[PDB]
Each structure stands twice: as structure tokens, then as C-alpha cells.
Amino acid sequence: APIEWESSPRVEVFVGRKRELSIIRNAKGVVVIYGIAGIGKTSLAAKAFPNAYWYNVTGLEDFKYFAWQLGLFLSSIGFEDLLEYLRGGGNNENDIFKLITEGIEKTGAIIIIDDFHKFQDEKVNYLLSYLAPRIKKGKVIITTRIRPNLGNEGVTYVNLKGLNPEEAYSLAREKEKSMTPEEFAKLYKLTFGHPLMLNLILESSEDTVFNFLFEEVYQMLNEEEKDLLSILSLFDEPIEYEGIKFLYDRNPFVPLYSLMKKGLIEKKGEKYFVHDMVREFVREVSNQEEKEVYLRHVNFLLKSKTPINFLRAFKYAIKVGSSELIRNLVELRVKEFYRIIVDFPRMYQRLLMEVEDNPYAKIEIAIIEVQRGLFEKAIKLLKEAEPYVDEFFKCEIYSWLADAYMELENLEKAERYLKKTKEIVEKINDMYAWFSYYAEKTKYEYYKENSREALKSALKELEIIRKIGDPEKEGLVLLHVGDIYLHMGNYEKGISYYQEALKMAKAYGIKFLEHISYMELAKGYYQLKLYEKASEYSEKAANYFLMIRNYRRATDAMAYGSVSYIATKNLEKAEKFAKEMIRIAQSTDYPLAWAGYIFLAAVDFLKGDDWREDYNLGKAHLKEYPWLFEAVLDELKKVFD
Ligand SMILES: Nc1ncnc2c1ncn2[C@@H]1O[C@H](COP(=O)(O)OP(=O)(O)O)[C@@H](O)[C@H]1O
Numbered sequence: 001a002p003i004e005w006e007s008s009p010r011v012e013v014f015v016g017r018k019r020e021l022s023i024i025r026n027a028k029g030v031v032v033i034y035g036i037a038g039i040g041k042t043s044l045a046a047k048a049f050p051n052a053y054w055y056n057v058t059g060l061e062d063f064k065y066f067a068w069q070l071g072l073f074l075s076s077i078g079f080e081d082l083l084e085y086l087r088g089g090g091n092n093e094n095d096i097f098k099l100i101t102e103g104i105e106k107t108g109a110i111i112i113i114d115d116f117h118k119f120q121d122e123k124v125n126y127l128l129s130y131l132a133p134r135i136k137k138g139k140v141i142i143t144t145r146i147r148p149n150l151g152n153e154g155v156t157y158v159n160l161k162g163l164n165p166e167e168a169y170s171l172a173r174e175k176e177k178s179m180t181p182e183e184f185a186k187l188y189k190l191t192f193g194h195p196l197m198l199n200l201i202l203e204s205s206e207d208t209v210f211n212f213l214f215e216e217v218y219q220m221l222n223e224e225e226k227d228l229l230s231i232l233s234l235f236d237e238p239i240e241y242e243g244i245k246f247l248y249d250r251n252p253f254v255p256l257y258s259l260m261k262k263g264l265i266e267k268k269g270e271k272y273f274v275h276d277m278v279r280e281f282v283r284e285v286s287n288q289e290e291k292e293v294y295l296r297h298v299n300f301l302l303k304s305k306t307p308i309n310f311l312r313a314f315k316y317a318i319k320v321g322s323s324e325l326i327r328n329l330v331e332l333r334v335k336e337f338y339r340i341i342v343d344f345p346r347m348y349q350r351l352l353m354e355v356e357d358n359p360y361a362k363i364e365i366a367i368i369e370v371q372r373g374l375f376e377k378a379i380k381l382l383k384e385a386e387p388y389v390d391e392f393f394k395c396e397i398y399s400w401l402a403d404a405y406m407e408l409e410n411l412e413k414a415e416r417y418l419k420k421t422k423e424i425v426e427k428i429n430d431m432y433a434w435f436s437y438y439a440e441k442t443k444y445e446y447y448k449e450n451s452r453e454a455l456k457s458a459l460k461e462l463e464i465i466r467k468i469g470d471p472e473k474e475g476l477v478l479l480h481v482g483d484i485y486l487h488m489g490n491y492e493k494g495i496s497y498y499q500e501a502l503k504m505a506k507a508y509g510i511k512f513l514e515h516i517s518y519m520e521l522a523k524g525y526y527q528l529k530l531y532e533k534a535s536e537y538s539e540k541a542a543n544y545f546l547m548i549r550n551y552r553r554a555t556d557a558m559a560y561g562s563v564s565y566i567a568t569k570n571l572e573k574a575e576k577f578a579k580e581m582i583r584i585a586q587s588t589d590y591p592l593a594w595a596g597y598i599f600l601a602a603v604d605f606l607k608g609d610d611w612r613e614d615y616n617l618g619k620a621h622l623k624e625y626p627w628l629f630e631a632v633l634d635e636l637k638k639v640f641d
Pocket residue numbers: 011013014015016036037038039040041042043044143171195196197199263266276
């Protein structure tokens with residue numbers, strides 16, 4: 001079913017070591033199952049708890065993507081739906097560590113992690129922030145090839161020693177009882193308890209050395225079995241069946257289940273991929289047709305059209321060695337990957353840096369370093385990859401170059417670089433190029449005191465967005481135009497623009513943009529001194545950013561909220577807001593947050609309390625002595641009351 005857990009079914013035959021199961025089931029904190037390939041760890045993890053959330057890790061793994069997929073799980077349970085996932089769409093921090101800890105502290109679901117990946121310290125650093133508190137309800141189990149060095153505090157290290165001879169003799173009899181029990185004593189002379197390698201011999205026939213043991217079994221395979229293995233071994237990720245069937249231009253069913261009977265291929269529900277021990281031995285039997293096979297798989301994932309399948313197609317488009325494939329792909333990266341390049345930067349970074357020499361890769365790498373603040377490296381790469389790009393990419397280079405010079409207080413050089421794009425979007429009449437053209441043009445004028453030309457450049461910008469059909473970017477402009485008109489002194493255009501954007505946010509179920517417009521709706525009514533409505537919409541926006549832990553805007557919400565509230569409403573609610581502004585002030589030291597401390601004094605003076613309780617003015621004014629911005633916020637409090 002769509003949008004569900006990847007709970008892989010266990011093996012048909014299994015004679016678990018019951019002591020190690022009671023170890024895992026009654027363990028505290030995190031259970032570490034480390035062994036060799038095919039030793040039985042993954043199958044043992046399934047034997048522990050069936051309905052546990054499974055996450056099979058692959059090569060490409062950004063910590064934010066895993067927590068995103070882990071956040072999708074916590075959102076499906078319903079306890080971290082409002083907190084975890086909605087903050088994933090917000091931003092990122094190490095506060096994610098305490099969110100997921102609080103996640104299975106509330107949900108209590110048991111989670112299992114299979115294998116090990118790159119950037120292991122980032123994942124190890126999260127793992128060590130959860131094993132120690134010992135959550136009374138949740139549990140996390142991992143299966144690794146090595147001991148992750150997580151310490152022995154709240155960790156149960158489980159080293160799998162294969163299978164007992166008595167259980168192994170039972171294993172062959174639980175598959176073929178009529179087979180002579182003497183022969184099983186000789187099988188232990190070959191596998192030494194290895195459960196997977198035992199299934200290989202039980203499903204085959206015919207002394208060989210350990211390496212030849214698998215290699216002389218590799219010759220027992222059929223024609224289509226060797227071809228299917230020698231192709232599926234080139235993929236480090238599980239694949240669907242139609243993805244496999246289109247991968248061969250030939251029906252792959254009969255070798256699939258046959259190798260499945262022998263344990264060479266494992267299925268995690270719907271997908272299939274070879275075992276890690278099978279992959280390490282047959283990836284060298286045929287490495288000539290990698291380009292053709294990878295090319296077909298790129299086109300299949302291109303038909304999937306999902307951000308994760310987007311990245312999977314990017315990894316194998318590097319192994320084909322075609323700069324033309326990377327050309328057309330980065331075009332589709334601006335179509336749909338554009339929205340989540342800020343979501344998965346480190347993942348996308350590792351795939352792009354794999355081809356640093358590619359000019360188109362130098363483009364998106366500069367975009368990452370644009371968001372990371374290193375504008376020098378961005379412009380540098382934007383000059384190196386300048387000639388090779390086409391006329392379509394030539395526009396996007398100068399648009400980001402204009403955005404690059406925008407954050408350097410360089411409007412003149414940003415104007416002449418966006419002047420280079422005045423003729424490209426009109427001559428090629430591309431929709432996507434026309435979008436980024438007027439997008440950076442609005443930002444160019446917004447940086448200037450002028451707020452007039454930005455009003456018309458954003459209008460024709462919306463004309464392009466109404467054609468593609470992406471709701472997120474269409475709501476972002478409607479909210480932003482509902483801000484330039486407010487700075488112009490106009491009120492009717494502002495209130496109607498982010499109210500229709502709220503009509504958009506409510507329609508598509510976007511809770512992030514929904515509470516962003518709530519902050520714009522409350523601020524607009526504050527400028528008109530409509531105390532009632534301005535204070536209400538600020539209450540729901542403040543509840544959001546306090547829950548999403550975006551205390552910067554959460555402070556801005558309760559600031560105008562506490563002001564407009566006491567104007568015509570009760571003093572206690574704004575006192576609650578002011579006291580919470582103190583709690584988040586004493587944690588983040590935000591300037592406008594200490595402005596709520598004196599708003600508490602405003603409540604105290606209006607609540608019949610003395611100047612000792614009105615001394616809170618002096619309590620935060622010495623805190624607000626360095627910041628000269630405090631001399632500005634006083635114009636709001638004395639005017640309304
Ligand atoms: N108790 C068992 N009984 C029978 N086969 C087993 C048992 N434990 C493991 N196996 C075999 O080993 C395989 C699982 O190996 P495993 O070490 O878990 O792989 P990985 O962790 O690399 O995915 C199973 O598919 C099966 O063939």
C-alpha cells in the first residue's frame with residue numbers, strides 16, 4: 001500500500017537462538033547486532049518484533065533525509081505529526097535529536113535499522129543521544145558489520161555466532177527430514193553454522209574451499225540466474241519488479257524466485273535486491289554493459305517522478321559517464337528537485353561533488369553554497385562553468401549571479417547581470433527560465449528602497465506559476481506580494497493577497513504556509529489597530545512557531561499579539577505570552593524576546609501592581625541597552641496604550 005512502513009517479511013525457515021531473542025526483546029535502550037554478511041542479523045531483527053519500522057539504509061544517505069523518512073513515520077503514528085514533520089519542512093538543527101527521542105518517548109514504537117552507511121558519525125551521534133536516556137517505551141535495534149563504538153552504557157552488544165549444530169541439523173530436517181541425519185554432521189564442516197550459506201547448499205547439490213564453495217555454487221546456477229545476478233549486483237538499492245523487468249527487456253520471474261529459494265536474493269516486501277554477500281562476488285563477472293543497464297534504470301526512475309527516485313536516478317547517471325545525461329537531468333532538477341534542494345543539501349551535495357568537473361554540477365554546487373553563505377565560492381564556480389552551458393542554463397547562471405551580487409550590496413553589478421537575461425527568456429520563451437528571471441528581478445528591487453517595480457515583476461511571475469501547477473511556490477509569491485503592498489502603505493491589497501494564499505494553503509493541506517499567512521493576517525490588522533482580530537490570528541501563529549520551535553518568528557508573533565491583546569482584551573493572555581517570551585528569551589537571547597519582558601511590566605502596571613513589579617521595565621532595558629533597535633519598539637507600546 002502507498003505510504004506505509006518497509007517492514008520486510010522474515011525468512012521462511014528460521015531456528016532462532018532463543019537466548020539472543022530474549023536478549024534483544026528484554027534489552028534496554030539500543031540493541032546492536034553485529035556479524036558478518038549473511039550471518040542472520042537482518043532475519044534475527046525481524047524475529048524480534050514484526051511491526052517494527054524498518055529502514056534499510058543504502059549508499060546515498062543524508063541524515064536529514066533519514067530523519068525526514070523517520071519523521072514521516074512519526075507523523076503517521078500521530079504523536080509527532082504536528083511537531084516533527086512540520087519542523088522538517090521548517091528548518092534543521094541538532095534539536096532533531098531530542099525530537100525523535102521525544103518521538104518514541106511518546107509513541108513507544110520499536111525501530112530497526114539495517115546495515116550501515118556514509119557519514120556514520122552523524123548517525124552515530126544521534127544514536128548515542130538516545131541509548132543513554134533509556135526510553136521506557138521506544139527501542140532501536142541496528143544490524144551492522146562492525147561494532148559502532150557506541151559505548152556500553154545502555155547498549156547491549158549482540159555478536160551473532162551463526163547457528164548451533166543441533167539447530168543446524170534441525171534446520172536441514174525442517175526442510176528435508178527424510179534426508180540422512182549423518183550428512184548434516186558433514187555440512188557443519190563447510191558452513192560452520194552459517195545460516196545463509198547453509199540454505200545455498202540445501203537448495204543445491206554436490207569438498208571445496210570457502211571462496212570456491214560459493215564460486216563452485218555459482219556454476220550450479222542456471223543461465224538466467226547468473227545474468228540476473230550479474231546485473232542486480234550493480235545496484236546498491238532494492239528495485240521493484242517492473243523496474244527489473246524493464247531493466248532486462250526480458251521476463252525475470254523464473255530466476256527471481258529460484259534465487260529467492262536459495263537465499264541469494266531478498267525481498268523487502270515489494271522490492272528486490274541481491275544479498276550483500278552475493279553482491280561482493282558477482283559484481284566482477286560482467287562489468288562491460290554497466291552503461292546500458294544503468295541507462296535503462298535511469299529512464300525507469302525518471303517515470304516514477306518522486307524526489308527519492310529522483311536521487312536514485314542521479315546516482316546511476318554518474319556511472320554511465322555521459323555528460324549529456326547529466327545535462328538533461330539537471331533541467332528536471334529545476335522542475336521538481338528545485339523544491340527540495342534546500343531539504344536534502346548534503347545528499348545532493350555528495351552526488352554532485354562526485355562530478356565536480358561537470359559544468360552543470362558546478363552550477364547546483366554553487367546554489368548549495370549560496371544557501372550556506374559562501375558567496376565567494378558560488379560566484380567562482382559560476383565563472384568557471386560559464387561557457388559550456390547552453391542558452392537555457394546561461395540565464396539561470398546570471399540570475400543566481402544577480403542573486404549572488406544581491407547579498408553583497410552590489411545592485412549595479414546585479415543589474416547588469418540580470419540585464420544579460422532580459423534577452424534570453426524572451427528569445428527562447430521558456431517557462432522555467434522566465435520564472436527565475438522575474439524571481440530574481442523582484443528580489444533586486446526589493447533590496448532597493450523602490451517597492452513599485454517589484455509589484456509588476458511578481459505579477460508576470462505568477463503568470464508562469466499558474467501553468468506548471470506547483471502549489472508551494474504559488475503560495476510563496478502570493479504571501480510575498482501581500483508584503484510589498486503593505487510596505488507601500490496599502491492595506492486592501494495586502495489583506496486580500498495572503499487571504500487567497502490562505503485559501504490555497506487550506507486547500508492543499510499545507511500547515512506550514514497556513515500559519516505563515518496567519519502571521520501576515522494578524523500583523524495587517526495590527527497596523528489598522530483592529531485589536532480583536534490581530535490578537536486572535538497571532539495566538540494561532542504563536543502556538544505554531546512555539547510548537548515548531550521557530551522561536552524567531554514565535555517571538556514576533558507573541559510580540560504584536562501581546563500588544564494588541566491588552567488594548568481591548570484581557571491582560572492575562574498577553575501576560576502568558578509575555579512570560580513565554582521570557583522563557584524563550586532566557587534560552588535564545590533574542591532581542592525582541594526581551595521586549596516581552598517589559599510588556600510583562602506593562603501588564604503589571606495595568607494589573608494594579610506596584611513599580612517593583614513595573615521594575616521589569618528596568619529588568620530588560622539593561623538587557624536592551626546594546627541593541628539600538630529597542631529605541632524603536634517603544635513607538636508601538638505607548639501609542640496603542
Ligand atoms: N535462523 C535462521 N534459519 C535459517 N536461515 C537463516 C537463519 N538466520 C539467517 N538465515 C539465513 O541468512 C539470511 C539472512 O542473513 P543476514 O545476515 O541477516 O543478512 P543481512 O543482514 O546482510 O541482510 C536469510 O535469508 C537466511 O537464508
